[PDB]
Amino acid sequence: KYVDKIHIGNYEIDAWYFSPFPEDYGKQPKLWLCEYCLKYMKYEKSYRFHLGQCQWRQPPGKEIYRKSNISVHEVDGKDHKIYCQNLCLLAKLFLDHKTLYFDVEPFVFYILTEVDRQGAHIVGYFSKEKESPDGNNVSCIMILPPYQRRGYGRFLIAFSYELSKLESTVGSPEKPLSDLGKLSYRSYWSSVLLENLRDLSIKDLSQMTSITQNDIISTLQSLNMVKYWKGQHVICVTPKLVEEHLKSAQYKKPPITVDSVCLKWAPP
């Protein structure tokens, strides 16, 4: 019997996939997580006791982003081993293709939190290899289900690439991307490419955004905005074909914007 339902903060959330919590925790009906330190418990009474004991009101690590009540925390797998393992155990409940939850030292995690008077509440996260050989600026990305399809996920993609802009490199998410993930990247890419051509070689669109050319190209093929000439992909679009696509219904909700002004990060 596996964990199938968590209680975290003020939400109960059904599980989507199997997550390797220790067998004693699995056999429980419900798992109870401190929304700040991510400690998981088997009983409401231990949960309730911890709630009055817990002194954490925010994630560990450094607050590298803060605009309004949106915040992002940098947490190093090496410096916060237990926390990051709980994080991956939580994320595995909603990621089919994540395979890594105890070997956290090679990774750095970026926690997205929403702040109120009581504290900074975890919305989602993405992981990132300290040293990625395949040039992957994202390993796993996860938005908690009650926060999905409301901007936070795209915000993390943007934030992932702004760190890519500060390291002077291009990066692509590791694969396979989940179903919600595939649709969120194509949408982000489309929106960033379209609003760069309303405002260029493919190699230029690749350095101005740190999007890999394959991701640029494949998105432009999805828009029918690229011609092929003797083995080469060429952007072909009129400013009108950028503007209809840009104002089509899909790009109408006001996103949460990464204001680089408010990003207190420096490359290693």
Ligand X SMILES: Cc1cc(-n2cccn2)cc(C(=O)NNS(=O)(=O)c2ccccc2)c1F
Q: Give the shortest CB-155-to-ligand X separation in angstroms.
A: 7
37 forms part of the interface with Zn ion (CB under 5 A): yes
Q: Give the shortest CB-192-to-Na ion separation in angstroms.
A: 31
Q: How far apart are the first and last CA of the chain?
A: 43
7 forms part of the interface with ligand X (CB under 6 A): no
Shorter beta-carbon distance to Zn ion: residue 59 or 153: 59
The entry of ligand X, Zn ion, Na ion, none near residue 184 (CB within 5 to 8 angstroms by kind) is ligand X
Closest CA to 253 of 178, 171, 149: 149
Q: How many CB atoms lie within 10 A of CB 32?
A: 22
Instruction: Kindly list the distances between the CA atom of residue 11 and the CA atoms of 14, 31, 123, 145, 263, in Å, as whole numbers in the listed order.
Output: 10, 12, 11, 10, 29
Give DSSP secondary structure letters for 149-217.
TSSHHHHHHHHHHHHHHHTT--B-B-SSPPHHHHHHHHHHHHHHHHHHH----HHHHHHTT-B-HHHHH
Shorter beta-carbon distance to Zn ion: residue 83 or 107: 83
152 forms part of the interface with ligand X (CB under 6 A): yes
Known catalytic residue at 74: no
Residue nearest to ligand X (CB): 153
Question: How many residues belong to the site for ligand X (CB under 6 A)?
Answer: 18
Of the candidate residues 58, 132, 169, 178, the single one contacting ligand X (CB under 6 A): 178
143 forms part of the interface with ligand X (CB under 6 A): yes
Catalytic residue among 35, 162, 167, 174: 174
Identity of the amino acid at 265: W
Shorter beta-carbon distance to Na ion: residue 77 or 124: 124
Q: Give the shortest CB-227-to-Zn ion separation in angstroms.
A: 56
**Alpha-carbon span 86 to 72, nearest angstrom:** 18
95 forms part of the interface with ligand X (CB under 6 A): yes
